[PDB]
Write a protein that binds this ligand. Structure first.
Ligand SMILES: *[C@@H]1O[C@H](CO)[C@@H](O[C@@H]2O[C@H](CO)[C@@H](O)[C@H](O)[C@H]2NC(C)=O)[C@H](O)[C@H]1NC(C)=O
Ligand SMILES: *[C@@H]1O[C@H](CO)[C@@H](O[C@@H]2O[C@H](CO)[C@@H](O)[C@H](O)[C@H]2NC(C)=O)[C@H](O)[C@H]1NC(C)=O
Ligand SMILES: *[C@@H]1O[C@H](CO)[C@@H](O[C@@H]2O[C@H](CO)[C@@H](O)[C@H](O)[C@H]2NC(C)=O)[C@H](O)[C@H]1NC(C)=O
Ligand SMILES: *[C@@H]1O[C@H](CO)[C@@H](O[C@@H]2O[C@H](CO)[C@@H](O)[C@H](O)[C@H]2NC(C)=O)[C@H](O)[C@H]1NC(C)=O
Ligand SMILES: *[C@@H]1O[C@H](CO)[C@@H](O[C@@H]2O[C@H](CO)[C@@H](O)[C@H](O)[C@H]2NC(C)=O)[C@H](O)[C@H]1NC(C)=O
Ligand SMILES: *[C@@H]1O[C@H](CO)[C@@H](O[C@@H]2O[C@H](CO)[C@@H](O)[C@H](O)[C@H]2NC(C)=O)[C@H](O)[C@H]1NC(C)=O
Ligand SMILES: *[C@@H]1O[C@H](CO)[C@@H](O)[C@H](O)[C@H]1NC(C)=O
Ligand SMILES: *[C@@H]1O[C@H](CO)[C@@H](O)[C@H](O)[C@H]1NC(C)=O
Ligand SMILES: *[C@@H]1O[C@H](CO)[C@@H](O)[C@H](O)[C@H]1NC(C)=O
Ligand SMILES: *[C@@H]1O[C@H](CO)[C@@H](O)[C@H](O)[C@H]1NC(C)=O
Ligand SMILES: *[C@@H]1O[C@H](CO)[C@@H](O)[C@H](O)[C@H]1NC(C)=O
Ligand SMILES: *[C@@H]1O[C@H](CO)[C@@H](O)[C@H](O)[C@H]1NC(C)=O
Ligand SMILES: *[C@@H]1O[C@H](CO)[C@@H](O)[C@H](O)[C@H]1NC(C)=O
Ligand SMILES: *[C@@H]1O[C@H](CO)[C@@H](O)[C@H](O)[C@H]1NC(C)=O
Ligand SMILES: *[C@@H]1O[C@H](CO)[C@@H](O)[C@H](O)[C@H]1NC(C)=O
Ligand SMILES: *[C@@H]1O[C@H](CO)[C@@H](O)[C@H](O)[C@H]1NC(C)=O
Ligand SMILES: *[C@@H]1O[C@H](CO)[C@@H](O)[C@H](O)[C@H]1NC(C)=O
Lengths: 438, 246, 395, 197, 49
């Protein structure tokens, strides 16, 4: 990284005189493709004698399907824990006078059949979902000419993809209710009923929650609104062109698809048997002699299923961690304003907007991110009347011969007064002190 | 990924000529006794089909069972016999006055007896008449002797190049597997030299042709198949770092 | 049976498969029906010598060893890679004879892993032989009252033979470092020696005829087939099929895939044959698994009730009877194949649940935003019954 | 040596992308921004502030007004020095820096050494020496023993990789905790109780 | 033995994929903990703290 040696200041300060409302974007997986595995269809296919061999071999696949069912139920539970959030389904606030803030591309439009916003549209376009997001029917796999697809092979080999319980449109409805409660109530709907509030003044309160008083907003309101709109448009364009929406979500989807394809392609492994074609074994060896090779194949395919389920459990542990993080960010930045540093954006968090994405959620973190720094000279506990004075929500910075008690994160110099500075302790005990004021 | 005896990519391949110089001054007929080793790759670039046979064996005489491949006009004749080859085997293409070919000389072996295998495949005719221009055909073969089986793989392709084995990828399809149980270590090619009335000396003349000998070595190859079962691409894992990563 | 418990709790369960058990078998061996020559192979007057062993093609044939039963009893009939019992249910694309005569005590040398003069200098069966070896005493045939001194065997050789590699040399072998220049002597050896099969010798010294039937089965058209009788063809039912020795269990359908002129079966991404060329009609039949994966059973609990619903995953409600092959299912299953409450979802076709347009909270998550619940219809529609309903989940 | 055996048996240790000196440079940059800007460099550009003032605001952030700091300023500094001096000394002799880090290093080394020692397991074969199997049996009869060894060593590798995946899951949990702590404890002042001390 | 492992299966691509994921995750852990900023600040020579 760039060397940025900052000159330590025994008596000087750098107060940023101009901020930058930046809409950072993060992408969090919330769920993974839940799958079901058939015991005999994968291990044996359509064979009565191989089924008997797998029956006398053991009962592994009841445990395997129990693990996979637990994974699927946890996927639904993660989706409830993040998207479901508030059950009260708030509809779009037709009154759109939000003080300049637009939300046009984040709040859904009824024009298109699906109540999915345009940013959500770009997100759903970017993630390919080339494995399970599309709808494939049994008639499609039954009738084919060129070559049997990967998905047809998985279906015919006992590998099925169970659809998520929450449809994408009702996921968008959860996100629309969250957005409506955020742009009409803000955060009060995360505790009880939604408490309506005009967006501008809850925005001012969200500044109040980062140490920047509301004196900033109503004085800069048009600039604030236009800055947020420009940021949302810029991230919209980058999402349209940079393909950054892939991120973690495309990696998760490709991971699941590649795991399923590995499971299918690993049916061609011999595992020490004469061949991986179970029917060639069954059509060339007597049941005694064929039992050795079929038991080798059963052990190999059972190990393949066990490995598949083992990294499915590990991947579901990762997905559950990310979904707990997504629920924490949903209930601490969409239902409130997190005071944790760098939890919901690089700068000082203002709010967040949930956006549905394939097997995940996108957070548009609105952050303060001050800039346009300016060196001043600072000295605490000014000595007036022989007593130290300390700045209540102030810094005691100086202009030329003029000392101003100043807000932390925004250069708004003000004159020293007793209703803004509190006195305690004799002066001269404090190390860096200077009065010449009040 | 398949471990087997392959022709390693970018291998050092022996190029041999068969050509007449200006006005029949320098004659290039070359039938060296090359080593078979672990099977070979043989490529022939020609305008007139002049490379018409092969000799396989160990001692290359009536001491040991030998193999002869003759791809003459009437047929392809594969004879595993005790071929007592003469010192300088070649075929002599007799040309009739009626613009027909009577290429029956058999200057390859002096005799044959007490032998096992005979084979004739695909009744077809192939001309050896002189054609103006450059080498118009490239014919590739892989010869192996594995588990008592003499395997030949072939690929035929019309190509127009100046010379020197045009660069490209060729996947040779299984041509014929022969149940000849013989030991093969050394081999030599059969060219055909022209006779008839090309020049009133009635000596020996040849047409332009080239043949290429490469050696199979035990490598690992990453092969790709299409739905037909045809190899459409191959990677030599030992060629270079990129191929090893592949 | 899927959960392995006589008591099932309320929910939805992915039953594996128990609907369909094929009741029909289909055999489609080609038109050969020609008795293969086993008198021109096994009943030959003279076999080759073990050093110069013969090898022949078998060509189009039915290979039924039953015809040889009252001809001779095969003392050795070890088979490799193929069980003898399956030899009558198979078709071979290529077959080779490899017939010769040895001594009795040397028949045990005709095996993949063997050492000895026969297994080192004469025959050398490979390690991946995948054919099989037939041997039978032939002291009645290959024995002269003065001893039959044909059937030469190579006694010395400078190196071990390679698999299936023949070797006729007639050279002179050097025991020591004294060249023979091709003449006999005391240190000079003729590498071949005659057996000398007298009739009244020990059973280890009596001749045995060995036929090493090396056969390979490829995707080429079948050449030799077993005695199995070709049945008819069933093209819409789950059956057991056996086309050219390639057995399986599935549904055969008319297919529009294109095979190579010499291709007998296709392959999937996995090692499963998804298409096969029926060698009688030469048509191409697609192969579909009998088992349909995706059937989920929705139960309110066995103690609560016994009525169930069935969700068929990613299928058309019209195609469900054809998808699960409802003709072969028991009528109690055929109740859930067709009916009136055959609600179609995005997840699949739900049969057995009365879809309602009301929006209740989820009880049993089905999929695609649809839930099922066991609701009291007795108090709803005059005198009705406690019943299962399906609906769109309430958010 | 153990490491020579691991290298000769296909087990290699890839060096971390960041060298220890780059790690030290990151930590020095963090310390410089923390003792010159305090926390403002975690959001935007570092904003210079004398240390005795960002410590006053850090008092302000725990309910103890700044009237406490300067009125005890010198003492505070010395006390911190005394405090730091104590961890200057105990860390030199208590071996507490081992803690869970030495446990992680020993766990990884023991896992690799276990993987190496599993090469002496027969797994039902005639011997664990693959060369003695290959120098006493023909390829057919050696197929069975080598396949048993392959299954055993593949299961050993699978167990090693699965335990490495679980270990990386817990290491990733601890690394997410460390990232959260350095974003809150170091880049700010966490209001969480018993999170940063 | 390499031929036997080749016909036996293709597990080691999966194993090396898992191990490569682990290694990349270790690098990403180090990046997310230690780096976390793209401005390298040098030591503040002015030591009056
Ligand atoms: C604070 O920053 C904002 C944004 O950079 C400044 O507003 C910009 O003013 C310039 C000059 O008129 C315009 O070209 C930009 O388009 C404006 N941006 C926005 C977001 O409106 C603003 O002038 C700055 N204020 C101070 C006091 O420095
Ligand atoms: C195939 O023939 C070659 C040569 O004709 C044989 O190799 C010779 O073997 C003898 C006996 O071991 C040695 O004394 C020679 O030095 C070898 N010569 C060469 C060039 O290798 C070879 O052994 C034969 N193959 C088989 C399987 O018998
Ligand atoms: C090509 O070679 C074959 C092989 O020798 C020739 O065919 C032989 O012809 C003679 C006399 O016509 C017969 O006695 C042999 O039985 C034939 N052998 C075979 C294998 O066919 C053929 O004549 C040659 N062609 C030309 C044009 O010379
Ligand atoms: C081909 O091999 C046969 C078999 O050995 C030879 O025929 C034998 O020749 C010897 C001469 O030493 C006679 O004693 C035998 O009676 C012959 N046997 C038979 C069955 O004919 C034949 O001579 C060999 N061919 C040539 C050209 O020498
Ligand atoms: C697989 O083989 C078929 C048949 O050889 C190929 O189809 C031929 O393609 C060529 C080139 O387009 C045409 O000239 C032929 O008329 C086609 N024949 C048939 C029967 O369709 C097919 O292209 C091959 N597959 C691939 C991937 O090349
Ligand atoms: C608060 O506690 C500190 C100790 O932490 C006291 O300072 C100590 O004073 C004694 C007596 O002079 C010295 O022996 C120690 O060495 C001092 N320690 C430090 C850290 O300076 C301090 O006096 C106490 N103040 C009150 C008001 O109780
Ligand atoms: C809000 O967005 C819509 C559509 O993008 C646009 O037509 C409108 O001008 C925007 N209004 C503001 C104030 O940005
Ligand atoms: C503040 O002082 C530093 C050190 O001299 C200098 O690099 C920087 O440019 C100054 N910034 C302003 C706004 O004066
Ligand atoms: C301010 O400080 C100066 C210097 O000590 C002192 O002389 C003056 O009296 C102080 N003013 C007040 C109001 O105490
Ligand atoms: C601020 O400082 C500048 C330069 O010293 C001076 O011109 C201006 O009057 C000062 N204003 C205030 C409010 O102190
Ligand atoms: C630093 O600031 C303190 C308090 O104003 C002062 O006493 C000290 O002399 C200053 N040191 C220097 C030279 O910067
Ligand atoms: C090819 O081999 C010959 C014979 O050893 C040698 O002279 C020649 O330099 C080799 N060429 C290359 C490119 O290796
Ligand atoms: C074949 O069958 C006939 C009829 O009974 C029988 O006489 C004959 O002995 C049988 N062949 C042998 C070798 O026994
Ligand atoms: C074998 O051949 C002999 C002589 O031709 C004949 O008598 C005998 O019946 C034959 N045996 C069989 C089984 O064909
Ligand atoms: C096979 O035989 C049956 C019955 O004789 C006949 O109907 C069918 O056409 C034949 N097919 C071929 C390919 O010979
Ligand atoms: C089922 O088949 C009917 C008949 O063509 C069709 O109208 C309907 O759309 C199909 N259902 C699907 C594709 O879900
Ligand atoms: C529920 O409403 C739909 C909407 O048209 C209607 O078709 C149906 O008959 C109603 N009753 C049901 C599904 O029992």
């Amino acid at each position: 990284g760039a060397e940025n040696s900052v000159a330590y200041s025994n008596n000087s300060i750098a107060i940023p005189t101009n901020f930058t409302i930046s809409v950072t974007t993060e992408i969090l997986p919330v769920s993974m493709t839940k799958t079901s595995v058939d015991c005999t269809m994968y291990i044996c296919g359509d064979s009565t004698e191989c089924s008997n061999l797998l029956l006398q071999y053991g009962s592994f696949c009841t445990q395997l399907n129990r693990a996979l069912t637990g994974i699927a139920v946890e996927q639904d539970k993660n989706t409830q824990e993040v998207f479901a959030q508030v059950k009260q389904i708030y509809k779009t606030p037709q009154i759109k006078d939000f003080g300049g803030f637009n939300f046009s591309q984040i709040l859904p439009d009824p024009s298109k059949p699906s109540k999915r916003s345009f940013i959500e549209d770009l997100l759903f376009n970017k993630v390919t979902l080339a494995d399970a997001g599309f709808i494939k029917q049994y008639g499609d796999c039954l009738g084919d000419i060129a070559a049997r697809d990967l998905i047809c092979a998985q279906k015919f080999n006992g590998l099925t993809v169970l659809p998520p319980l929450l449809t994408d449109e009702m996921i968008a409805q959860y996100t629309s209710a969250l957005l409506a409660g955020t742009i009409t109530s803000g955060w009060t709907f995360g505790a009880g009923a939604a408490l309506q509030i005009p967006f501008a003044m809850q925005m001012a309160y969200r500044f109040n929650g980062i140490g920047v008083t509301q004196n900033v907003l109503y004085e800069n309101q048009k600039l604030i609104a236009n800055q947020f709109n420009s940021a949302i448009g810029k991230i919209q364009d980058s999402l349209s062109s940079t393909a950054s929406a892939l991120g973690k979500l495309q990696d998760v989807v490709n991971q699941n698809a590649q795991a399923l394809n590995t499971l299918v392609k690993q049916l061609s492994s011999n595992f020490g048997a004469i061949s991986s074609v179970l029917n060639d074994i069954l059509s060339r060896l007597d049941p005694p002699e064929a039992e050795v090779q079929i038991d080798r194949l059963i052990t190999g395919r059972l190990q393949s299923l066990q490995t598949y389920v083992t990294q499915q459990l590990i991947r579901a542990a990762e997905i559950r961690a990310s979904a707990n993080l997504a629920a924490t960010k949903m209930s601490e930045c969409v239902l409130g304003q997190s005071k944790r540093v760098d939890f919901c954006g690089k700068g000082y968090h203002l709010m967040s907007f949930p956006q549905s994405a394939p097997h995940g959620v996108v957070f548009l973190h609105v952050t303060y991110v001050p800039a346009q720094e300016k060196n001043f000279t600072t000295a605490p506990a000014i000595c007036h009347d022989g007593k130290a004075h300390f700045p209540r929500e102030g810094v005691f910075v100086s202009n030329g011969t003029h000392w101003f008690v100043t807000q932390r994160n925004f250069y708004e110099p003000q004159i020293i007064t007793t209703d803004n500075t509190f006195v305690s302790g004799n002066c001269d005990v404090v190390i860096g002190i200077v009065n010449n004021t009040v | 990924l398949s471990q087997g005896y392959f022709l390693p990519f970018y291998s050092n391949i022996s190029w041999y000529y068969a050509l007449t110089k200006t006005n029949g001054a320098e004659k290039r007929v070359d039938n060296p006794i090359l080593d078979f080793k672990d099977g070979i790759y043989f490529a022939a670039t020609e305008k007139s089909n002049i490379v018409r046979g092969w000799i396989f064996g160990t001692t290359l005489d009536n001491t040991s069972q030998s193999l002869l491949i003759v791809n003459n006009a009437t047929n392809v004749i594969i004879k595993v016999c005790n071929f007592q080859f003469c010192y300088d085997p070649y075929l002599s293409g007799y040309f009739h006055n009626n613009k027909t070919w009577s290429t029956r000389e058999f200057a390859v072996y002096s005799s044959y007896a007490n032998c096992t295998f005979e084979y004739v495949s695909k009744p077809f005719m192939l001309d050896i008449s002189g054609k103006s221009g450059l080498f118009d055909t490239l014919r590739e073969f892989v010869f192996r002797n594995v588990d008592g089986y003499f395997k030949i793989y072939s690929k035929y392709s019309p190509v127009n190049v100046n010379s020197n084995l045009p660069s490209g990828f060729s996947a040779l399809e299984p041509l014929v597997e022969l149940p000849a149980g013989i030991n093969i270590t050394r081999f030599r090619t059969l060219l055909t030299i022209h006779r008839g009335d090309p020049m009133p000396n009635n000596g020996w003349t040849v047409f332009s042709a080239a043949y290429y000998v490469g050696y199979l070595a035990p490598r690992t190859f990453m092969l790709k198949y299409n739905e037909n079962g045809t190899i459409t691409d191959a990677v030599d894992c030992s060629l270079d770092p990129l191929s090893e990563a592949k | 049976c899927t959960l392995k418990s006589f008591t099932v709790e309320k929910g939805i369960y992915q039953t594996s498969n128990f609907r369909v058990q094929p009741t029909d078998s289909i055999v489609r061996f080609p038109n050969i029906t020609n008795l293969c020559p086993f008198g021109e192979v096994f009943n030959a007057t003279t076999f080759a010598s073990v050093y110069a062993w013969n090898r022949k093609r078998i060509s189009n044939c039915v290979a039924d060893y039953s015809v040889l039963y009252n001809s001779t009893s095969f003392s050795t009939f070890k088979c490799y890679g193929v069980s003898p019992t399956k030899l009558n249910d198979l078709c071979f694309t290529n077959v080779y004879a490899d017939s010769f005569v040895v001594r009795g005590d040397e028949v045990r040398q005709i095996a993949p892993g063997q050492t000895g003069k026969i297994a080192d200098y004469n025959y050398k069966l490979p390690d991946d032989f995948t054919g099989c070896v037939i041997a039978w005493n032939s002291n009645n045939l290959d024995s002269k009252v003065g001893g039959n001194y044909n059937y030469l065997y190579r006694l010395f050789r400078k190196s071990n033979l390679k698999p299936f590699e023949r070797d006729i040399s007639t050279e002179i072998y050097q025991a020591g470092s004294t060249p023979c220049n091709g003449v006999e002597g005391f240190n000079c050896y003729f590498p071949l020696k005659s057996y000398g099969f007298h009739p009244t010798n020990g059973v280890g010294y009596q001749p045995y005829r060995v036929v090493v039937l090396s056969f390979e089965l490829l995707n080429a058209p079948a050449t030799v087939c077993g005695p199995k009788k070709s049945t008819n063809l069933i093209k819409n039912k789950c059956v057991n099929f056996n086309f050219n020795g390639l057995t399986g269990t599935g549904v055969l359908t008319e297919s529009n895939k294109k095979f190579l002129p010499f291709q007998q079966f296709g392959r999937d991404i996995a090692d499963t044959t998804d298409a096969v060329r029926d060698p009688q009609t030469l048509e191409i039949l697609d192969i579909t698994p009998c088992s349909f994966g995706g059937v989920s059973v929705i139960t309110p609990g066995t103690n609560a009730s016994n009525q169930v619903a069935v969700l068929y995953q990613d299928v058309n409600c019209t195609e469900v009877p054809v998808a699960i092959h409802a003709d072969q299912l028991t009528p109690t299953w055929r109740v859930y194949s067709t009916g009136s409450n055959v609600f179609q979802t995005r997840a699949g076709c739900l049969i057995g649940a009365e879809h309602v347009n009301n929006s209740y909270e989820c009880d049993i998550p089905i999929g695609a935003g649809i839930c099922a619940s066991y609701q009291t219809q007795t108090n709803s529609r005059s005198v009705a019954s406690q019943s299962i309903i399906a609906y769109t989940m309430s958010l």
